[PDB]
Amino acid sequence: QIVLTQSPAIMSASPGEKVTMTCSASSSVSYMHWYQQKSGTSPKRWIYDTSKLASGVPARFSGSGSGTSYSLTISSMEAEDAATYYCQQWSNSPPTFGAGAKLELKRADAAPTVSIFPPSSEQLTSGGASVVCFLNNFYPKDINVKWKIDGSERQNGVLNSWTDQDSKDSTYSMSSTLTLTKDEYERHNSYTCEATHKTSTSPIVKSFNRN
Amino acid sequence: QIVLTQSPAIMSASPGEKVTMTCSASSSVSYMHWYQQKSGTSPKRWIYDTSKLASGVPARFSGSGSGTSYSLTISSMEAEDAATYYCQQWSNSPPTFGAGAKLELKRADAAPTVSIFPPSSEQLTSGGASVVCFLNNFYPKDINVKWKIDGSERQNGVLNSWTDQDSKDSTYSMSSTLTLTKDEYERHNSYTCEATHKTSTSPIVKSFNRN
Amino acid sequence: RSTTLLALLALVLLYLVSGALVFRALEQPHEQQAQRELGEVREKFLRAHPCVSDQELGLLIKEVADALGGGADPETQSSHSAWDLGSAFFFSGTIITTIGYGNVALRTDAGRLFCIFYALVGIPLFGILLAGVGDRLGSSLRHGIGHIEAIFLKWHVPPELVRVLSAMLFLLIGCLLFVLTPTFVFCYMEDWSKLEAIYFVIVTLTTVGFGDYVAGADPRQDSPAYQPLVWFWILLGLAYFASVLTTIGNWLR
Amino acid sequence: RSTTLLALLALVLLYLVSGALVFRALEQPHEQQAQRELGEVREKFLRAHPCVSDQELGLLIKEVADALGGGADPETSHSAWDLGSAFFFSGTIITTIGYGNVALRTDAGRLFCIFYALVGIPLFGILLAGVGDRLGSSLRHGIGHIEAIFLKWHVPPELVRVLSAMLFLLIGCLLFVLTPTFVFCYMEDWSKLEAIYFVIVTLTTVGFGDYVAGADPRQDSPAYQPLVWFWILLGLAYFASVLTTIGNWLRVV
Amino acid sequence: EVQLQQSGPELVKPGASMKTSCKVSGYSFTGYIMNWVKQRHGKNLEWIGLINPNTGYTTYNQKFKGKATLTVDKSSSTAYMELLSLTSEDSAIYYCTRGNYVFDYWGQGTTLTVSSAKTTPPSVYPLAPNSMVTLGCLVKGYFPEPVTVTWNSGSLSSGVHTFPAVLQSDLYTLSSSVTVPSSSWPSETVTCNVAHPASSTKVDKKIVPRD
Amino acid sequence: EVQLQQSGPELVKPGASMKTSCKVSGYSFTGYIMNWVKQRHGKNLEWIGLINPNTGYTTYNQKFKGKATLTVDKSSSTAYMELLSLTSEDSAIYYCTRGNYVFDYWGQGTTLTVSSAKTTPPSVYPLAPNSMVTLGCLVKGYFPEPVTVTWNSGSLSSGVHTFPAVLQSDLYTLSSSVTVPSSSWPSETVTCNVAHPASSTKVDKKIVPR
Ligand SMILES: CCCCCCCCCC
Ligand SMILES: [Ca+2]
Ligand SMILES: [Ca+2]
Ligand SMILES: [Ca+2]
Ligand SMILES: [K+]
Ligand SMILES: [K+]
Ligand SMILES: [K+]
Ligand SMILES: [K+]
Ligand SMILES: [K+]
């Protein structure tokens, strides 16, 4: 019943930076707990009863708060601190959780390396036509892709996919996939993938002509 | 400070007999528990919550009661049932115990085999003089011993010791030990040990002359 | 009269002892049962939670009891206010009327201190108003009776009996308006039984004010005008209970 | 006057609204303390006893509440309907004090209570008037001896009457207000303010029930419990006499 | 070392039910409250309910009242959750976790997949088109997860991103990118190797430059 | 198989105090209440008090309020009882037992002896005087308990009673009987073997006819 809001839901920190995430409660609770989760694995009790540290936890983490406002803090970010942190309460049954706050590593901005790929002949023979675009190794994560067919924009039949932050270079990558029927595909000639990222005012555009 | 009374404190049963021991409470009590103890060892939870049997316990045992009056019953006595049983309560702190009910095996009455022993020469040389009487393998347990020196009774420096009921023949035995100084001993000549048991109206008497 | 005072003392004393016998006979068994149930609840909780000593559970219960005794509600974990303007108004009423339900206690020393002077000044002030309303209410009733009394006298019933009959009607209608009417009202409004409602009414108009029952106190009710308006009744009823008893006393003397 | 009584209504009304404002201001900020405490006790227990779910603790607390609500007492001789406590309880009725710290649970209890009071209160009122006159007699007589001194000191007979009334209440106050409050402070481990609060709530017959002295006897101090009853009797009579005369002064004004 | 060992992933048809387990070791099962929690892909954590292994007592989140049944086996210190009338929205990761106020230990989680779909091998299509050049593999229409994508039998492992699968009309699709020096391609062959264990499918696709 | 393993018998001087222990295994120490119980020689059981190993909470029998202190070591799941300013009244057997309403598992007990006596080996004296004959060994003036008595190195095991020790002016005395066919004695030798472990004393005594 009690609702926990963690905002913002995403944030980023360079190593050495101080990090503070908050949890606001729809009505007062006596204690707040926090979990750390890294993709692939279960949550770990990180801080409990507001400010007690679980066994494993290094000192750079601390917690505080009271009534309806609680926080988790990292005095000085480290690399292994990249994770999603969740608050939870059990001063009223049922217990409840915040929706989590994802904490990513900051780095120098990077432009997407963009590549567009025409349908394979193999696929075409089975009547399908998927046009694919890779937007690789960029930062930060906010990016927009636009598809154009014969100059005209298309948004339907498009599916997107983001990787997790790369654990070595801290970049992101995404695929975008325009799936058409062979019919639609063969009707037009020019196919363009167009990327808008912070790193430039002008889109990055890869195109190809069916012939 | 609820008080639990087990009366009588001693009882005896032949094998096959039905045995009932009771526990009355100074004020009402919701459940009674019972422990079995055999000499030499710790008590064992026997019955708990009035009528539940602990894991070890054979079916011939049962319990019942309510309010202020509780009982433990053996449908049919057996040999291994000889023990002390204790009731206890914890419907009020502090928990308390009955003073226990000692349950011995009944058997055919047996007269004491009596032996008297003069001081060893070894002992005498060191200045002490202990005269010993064994009253062995009799039943029931109630028995009385009398020491006589030169026909006249002595009841100082006498020490007695009873065995537990024997595990195989269910008898009892006791020692009586008249301890004197060598002086006192050598002053008299006739020493007699005299046993009164219900098996005979007339005492059993073993004597010896110092000569 | 010293002799009579001592007789009267002895009588009352017997009225109390007789009361005591009856309340014990009617209530002790229910109480002794509840005590049993509390202990059963403990014993059951121990059997289910081996991490708990009886003595520890005892402390929990004492602590819970104290909180409930201070008006905590078992059902929730934490919207409505017992000290909103309307309920505080009501509470003040319970003082000057000397009714003193007490279903919501003062927690602050200031509250208590203030309450002392509020009452010392409030109760006599109210007594005055009550006498006033008692005389005025009896006047209005007596005037209304007069017109119907004209009919009885023409019917050649003796003036002495007509006075008696009118008293019967006088109280019966008051009773109707201030005892019966309210009890029927509360039955429906509070979800009490008829017997609970009369119990409440009478406990109230006698100014005994136990506090086991209190109209409007129920948290769920969306009834702002209700609780002070009930006080309107309390005012009128108390005075009538008073004025009638006063005139009865005068007739006796 | 009807016009004036309407004015008096309006005054009282303002006395209530003014009271309401003050109680709300003093008490609303602590409405929730008891819940808070209950929750703290729960949370603390859970942290100590990992074999217990919050929900399970909840049910325990409900079950405890039901039993307490039936008159059970936390145990670590406590019967409210034994002869002595029932005697006391009957007292609380006929005095109209009505502490109510122990509620009737049975419909028979309630029914009987109605008739017990209807007959009991007036009967007691009579005895009270009686003791009021006899107590005032004793006081005024003693004060008369001190009055002799004032009259010889050529202090006007009008002021001597006033000094004696001030003395009359001041000495009563000492005996029935001050003396008891100091007594209860030590006996009940209340604060001075709690004790006066109690005293005055009691003698005014407001009878909230948040504080109650003499419901049960104290081992190692036998005279305590009766003296309290004796006290209530005498104190009520002293208080009554003050109210009647201050009522007396008021109505002519 | 406390440990909650959950049973493996499960795949079931819509409508069916499913029972999953959590065996505890390192502490005494009956001493602590067990809970279960749902996490639908990378989103908020949801408390399902609890059981008290010692008493059998259960409570549930209203959301899950009809849905989930918690039970325990004391002898094998194991906790069970049954889920009923499964729908697509039940596909998630489920945890057992311990605690009556904070959740101090969690199982590793178990993934439940609810779907009508049949085991289908993937179609694998090559993606062919600066010093560096980017090539790809489109892997579409397979069920269930996972597939494995390697490049030149895993001898080509740096420069690779495999994107998360997505559901398209009950089947999965993903692609994998690999970036290599253009001196290497097409001078040297590049093949992506795709394995789909569920269908015993192993497919190799050579990337060939567009004719 | 739940088990409460108590530490061994303890012997201390009047006035001293004494700490004894109970290690639990087979269940989780912190999940149950631990109690201690006194039994002075073969007589009523007395609850001393309890501790909650998880919370540290203790309550005591009023009788033992000042006398006994309960503590626990959670890490080694061990419970301790300390007894203070010991007198002879404290000599008894003490049990740890588990439970918050019934006492469902008990340690094997530990015997406390409070005494001024010093380790003393026993004097062993033979007891010599029908189809059966009874012979004995008087074993006196030893401390502390126990001694053990066998006959012909254990070849004679039927017909044997060893009587309980009794205190004689701060030292123990007992005797042992053995009954044999009179054809066997003194045609064959009979010797009692007495061991007093505390003093490392092992003594054989041949029974010789008067
Ligand atoms: C006696 C307390 C002050 C008010 C008395 C009025 C009682 C009315 C019903 C008998
Ligand atoms: Ca009670
Ligand atoms: Ca009482
Ligand atoms: Ca030691
Ligand atoms: K109350
Ligand atoms: K009153
Ligand atoms: K009252
Ligand atoms: K009252
Ligand atoms: K009241």
What DSSP line would sit under chain E, residue for residue?
Answer: --EEEE---EEE-TT--EEEEEEEESS-GGGS-EEEEEE-TTS-EEEEEEE-TTT--EEE-GGGTTTEEEEEETTTTEEEEEE-S--GGG-EEEEEEE-SSS--EE---EEEEE--PPPBPPEEEEE----EEEEEEEEEEEBSS--EEEEGGGT--TTEEEPPPEEETTEEEEEEEEEEETTTTTTS-EEEEEEEGGGTEEEEEEE----
Residue B202: alpha-carbon gap to chain centroid: 24
Subunits in contact with chain D (3 or more CB pairs closer than 8 Å): A, C, E, F
Q: What are phi and psi of C121, to 5 degrees?
A: -85, -30
Q: Structure tokens of A149? A: 């067919």
Which of C41, C43, C55 to mutate to probe the B interface, most B CBs <10 Å?
Answer: C43
Within 10 angstroms of residue A105's Cβ, the number of other Cβ atoms is 19
Mutate to test the pocket of ligand 1, among C94, C126, C207 (most ligand atoms within 8 A of CB): C207
Domain harbouring E64, CATH code: 2.60.40.10
Provide the CA A77 distance to its chain's centre, in angstroms.
19
Structure tokens at F68: 């006994």
Q: Which residues contact F188 (CB under 8 A, 6 or more apart)?
A: none
Helix (H, G, I), strand (E, B) or coil at D45: helix
Q: Most B CBs within 10 Å: which of F161, F170, F171, F173, as the mutation test of the B interface?
A: F161
Instruction: List Cα–Cα distances, F180 to F91, F102, F131, F134, in angstroms.
Output: 38, 48, 9, 6
Distance (Å) of CA A156 to CA A153, A159, A160, A176: 10, 9, 12, 12
- Nearest CA to D34 out of C242, C76, C250, C71 is that of C71
- HEC letters along chain F: CCEEEECCCEEECCCCCEEEEEEEECCCHHHCCEEEEEECCCCCEEEEEEECCCCCCEEECHHHCCCEEEEEECCCCEEEEEECCCCHHHCEEEEEEECCCCCCEECCCEEEEECCCCCECCEEEEECCCCEEEEEEEEEEEECCCCEEEEHHHCECCCEEECCCEEECCEEEEEEEEEEECCCCCCCCEEEEEEEHHHCEEEEEEECCC
Going by alpha carbons, the residue nearest to atom 9 of ligand 1 is C206
Say if ligand 1 is within 6 A of residue C202 CB: no
D205 in contact with ligand 1, CB cutoff 6 A: yes
Please name which ligand lies nearest the alpha carbon of F80: 4
Same domain, F42 and F106: yes
* Angle formed by the axes of helices D83-94 and D107-152, nearest 10°: 70
Q: What are phi and psi of B193, to 5 degrees?
A: -115, 130
Region of residue A154 (phi > 0: left; psi between -120 and 50: alpha; otherwise: beta): beta
C78: contact with A, CB 8 A cutoff:
yes
Residues of F in contact with B193 (CB under 8 A): none
Q: Of the candidates F166, E172, D37, which has an alpha carbon nearest to the alpha carbon of residue C78? A: D37
The three-point CA angle E155-E157-E163 to 5° equals: 135
**Same domain membership, residue E124 and residue E57:** no
Asked if E138 and A120 count as a contact pair (C-beta separation under 8 A), the reply is yes
Closest CA of chain D from C24, distance in Å: 5
- Cβ-based neighbours of B107, under 8 Å, separated by 6 or more: B14, B139, B169, B170, B171
Distance CA(D28)–CA(D24), nearest Å, equals 5
Phi/psi of residue A175, nearest 5 degrees: -110, 150
Between helix D83-94 and helix D224-252 the angle, nearest 10°, is 0
Give the side-chain half-sphere CA count within 13 A for D35. Answer: 13
What tokens appear for D184 in the block?
A: 């209860």
Q: Which residues of E touch F24 (CB under 8 A)?
A: none
- Coil, strand or helix at A34: strand
- Rounded-to-integer distance, Cα C95 and Cα C124, Å: 11
Tracing tokens 């996919």 back to the chain, one arrives at A161
Bridge-partner residues for C143, per DSSP? none
Contact flag for E and B (3+ C-beta pairs < 8 Å): no
- Among E5, E41, E161, E176, most A C-beta atoms within 10 A, so best to mutate, is E161
Collect all residues of chain A within an 8 Å Cβ-Cβ radius of residue E149. none
* Whole-number Å distance between alpha carbons of A128 and E169: 14
Same domain, F84 and F121: no
All CATH 2.60.40.10 domain ranges in chain B, comma separated: 1-107, 108-210
Nearest CA-CA partner of F190 in F149, F145, F148: F149
Q: State how far the Cα of A182 lies from the Cα of C141, in Å rounded to an integer.
A: 100
Residue type, C165: L
Q: How far is CA A137 from the centre of its chain?
A: 14
Give the position of tokens 């699968």.
E165
Q: How far is CA F175 from CA B112, B115, D89, F162, F164, in A?
A: 17, 13, 72, 6, 8
A30: contact with D, CB 8 A cutoff: yes
Instruction: Look at D50 and E32 and tell me if their CB atoms are within 8 Å.
Output: yes
Write the Ramachandran bin of B40: left for phi over 0, alpha for psi from -120 to 50, otherwise beta.
left
Report the 3 state secondary structure along C18-48. Answer: HHHHHHHHHHHHHHHHHHHHHHHHHHHHHHH
In eight-state DSSP terms, residue D185 is H
CA A188 and chain centroid, separation: 34
**Ligand 5 centroid distance, CA of D99 (Å):** 10
Buried b (16+ CB within 10 A) or exposed e, D114-148: bebbeebbeebbebbebbbeebbeebeeebeeebe
CB C121 within 8 A of CB D11: no
C246 marked as part of a ligand binding site: no
Annotated binding-site positions of D for K(+): 96-99, 205-208
**C79 touches A at CB < 8 Å:** no
Is the Cβ–Cβ distance between B88 and F97 less than 8 Å? no
Under an 8 A CB cutoff, do D16 and C92 touch? yes
Supply D49's token pair: 């006893």
* Domain of residue D122, CATH code: 1.10.287.70
- Contact check, Cβ <8 Å, F61/B94: yes
Cis-peptide, bond into residue F129, ω within 30° of zero:
no
**Half-sphere exposure for D178 (CA within 13 Å, toward CB):** 7
Task: Report the alpha-carbon distance of residue A19 to residue A26 in Å, rounded.
Answer: 23
CA of D83 to the centre of ligand 2 (A): 13
Q: Which residues of E130-164 are buried (b: 16+ CB within 10 A; e: fewer)?
A: eeebbbbbbbbbbbbbebebbbbeeebeebbbbbb
Cβ proximity of F35 and F99 under 8 Å: yes
Residues B182, B127 contacting (CB under 8 angstroms): yes
Q: Which amino acid is at D235?
A: G
- Asked if residue E100 and residue E2 are part of one domain, the reply reads yes
Method used to determine the 3D structure:
X-ray
Q: Which residue of F has its CA nearest to E26?
A: F28
- Residue A102 near chain E (CB below 8 Å): no
Note whether F31 contacts E: Cβ–Cβ < 8 A.
Answer: yes
> Cβ(D131) to ligand 1 under 6 A?
no
Q: Are the beta carbons of D215 and D208 closer than 8 angstroms?
A: no
Same domain as F90, residue F41 = yes
Contact A88 E103 (CB under 8 A): yes
CATH of B1-107, one of 2.170.120.12, 2.60.40.10, 3.20.20.60, 2.60.40.3880: 2.60.40.10
| Structural domain harbouring D17 | 1-253
Contact D55 A93 (CB under 8 A): yes
Decide if E96 contacts E6 (C-beta within 8 A): yes
Chain A interface test: which of C73, C76, C77, C79 (most A C-beta within 10 Å): C77
- Give the chain F residue nearest B131 (alpha carbons): F127
Centre of ligand 8 to C-alpha D197, Å, is 14
Tell me the residue range of the domain where E142 lies. Answer: 117-211
The torsion angles phi and psi of C104, rounded to 5 degrees, stand at -130, 115
- In eight-state DSSP terms, residue D52 is -
Sequence-distant (≥ 6) Cβ neighbours of residue E68 within 8 angstroms = E36, E48, E49, E60, E81, E82, E83, E84
Nearest of A77, A90, A81 to residue A49 by alpha carbon: A90
The candidate with the shortest Cα–Cα distance to E94, out of E109, E76, E79, is E109
**Rg of the Cα atoms in chain E:** 22
Q: How many CB atoms lie within 10 A of CB B5?
A: 13
Residue for token pair 């994107």:
E163
Element (H, E) at A102: strand A101-105
C55 part of contact set with chain F, CB < 8 Å: yes
As a whole number of angstroms, the distance between CA B200 and CA D4 comes to 112
H/E run at residue A86? strand A83-89
Tokens of F154: 């254990």
Residue D198, helix vs strand vs coil: helix
For the record, the structure tokens of F105 come out as 């598992």
Ligand 1 pocket member C81 (CB < 6 A): no
- Give the pairing of strands E10-12 and E110-114: parallel
Residue of A30, A31, A93 lying closest to D54 (CB–CB): A93
Between helices C159-174 and C226-252, what is the axis angle to 10°? 160
Task: Kindly state the tokens that stand for E98.
Answer: 């311990």
Q: Judge if the upstream peptide bond of residue B8 is cis by omega within 30 degrees of 0.
A: yes
Within this chain, do residues F9 and F66 fall inside the same structural domain, yes or no? yes
CB < 8 Å to E30, chain D: 51
Helix (H, G, I), strand (E, B) or coil at B28: coil
The end-to-end CA distance of chain E, in Å, is 61
Q: Give the separation between CA C70 and CA D118, rounded to whole angstroms.
A: 31
Please tell me the distance from the alpha carbon of residue B173 to that of residue B165, in angstroms, as a whole number.
Answer: 8
What is the amino acid identity at position E104? D
Would you call B105 helix, strand, or coil by DSSP? strand
Distance CA A44, CA E45 (A): 13
The three-state secondary structure class of D54 is helix
C33: amino acid identity, one letter: Q
Tell me, what DSSP letter sits at residue D221? B
CA C242 to ligand 1: nearest atom: 8
Structure tokens at E84: 């009923």
The enclosing H or E element of D148 equals helix D107-152
| Pocket of ligand 1 contains residue D121 by CB under 6 Å | yes
Q: Cα separations (Å) of E112 from C245, D31, E26?
A: 80, 48, 26
Domain count, chain D: 1
- Residue partners of B82: CB distance under 8 A and separation at least 6: B38, B103, B104, B105, B165
Contact indicator for F127, B132 with CB cutoff of 8 Å: yes
Residues contacting residue D118 through CB under 8 Å, at least 6 positions apart? C202, C206
Angle between helices C109-154 and C85-96 (to 10 degrees): 70
* CA dihedral of residues C19, C21, C27, C31 (deg, nearest 10): 130
Q: What is the 3-state secondary structure (H, E, C) of chain C?
A: CHHHHHHHHHHHHHHHHHHHHHHHHHHHHHHHHHHHHHHHHHHHHHHHCCCCCHHHHHHHHHHHHHHHHCCCCCCCCCCCCCCCHHHHHHHHHHHHCCCCCCCCCCCCHHHHHHHHHHHHHHHHHHHHHHHHHHHHHHHHHHHHHHHHHHHHHHCCCCHHHHHHHHHHHHHHHHHHHHHHHHHHHHHHHHCCCHHHHHHHHHHHHCCCCCCCCCCCCCCCCCCCCHHHHHHHHHHHHHHHHHHHHHHHHHHHC
Contact F31, E31 (CB under 8 A): yes
Please tell me whether residue B52 adopts helix, strand or coil conformation.
strand
Shared domain check, F64 and F35 = yes
Looking at domain A108-210, which CATH architecture does it have? Sandwich (2.60)
DSSP conformation letters of D75-126: -----TTSHHHHHHHHHHHHTS----SS---SHHHHHHHHHHHHHHHHHHHH
Which among F132, F87, D179 has a CA at the least distance from the CA of B115?
Answer: F132
What secondary structure does DSSP assign to A119-157, as a single string? PPHHHHHTTEEEEEEEEEEEBSS-EEEEEEETTEEE-TT
Torsion of CA C226, C231, C232, C238, to 10 degrees: 150
Q: Tell me how far apart the alpha carbons of residues C207 and C245 are, in angstroms, rounded to a whole number.
A: 14
Read off the tokens for B199. 């098996």
Give the nearest ligand 1 atom to D205 CA. 2
CB of D172 closer than 8 Å to CB of D136: no
Residue A24 neighbours by CB distance under 10 Å: 16
Collapsing DSSP states into helix, strand and coil, what is residue A66? strand
From edge to edge, which strands make up the β-sheet containing B172-181? B113-117, B128-138, B172-181, B158-162
Could you identify the residue written with the tokens 């108009």? C205
Pair E188, E141 in one domain: yes
Question: Looking at the structure, do residues E123 and E58 belong to the same domain, yes or no?
Answer: no
User: Cα separations (Å) of C36 from B49, C187, D66?
Assistant: 17, 32, 12
The total number of structural domains in chain F stands at 2
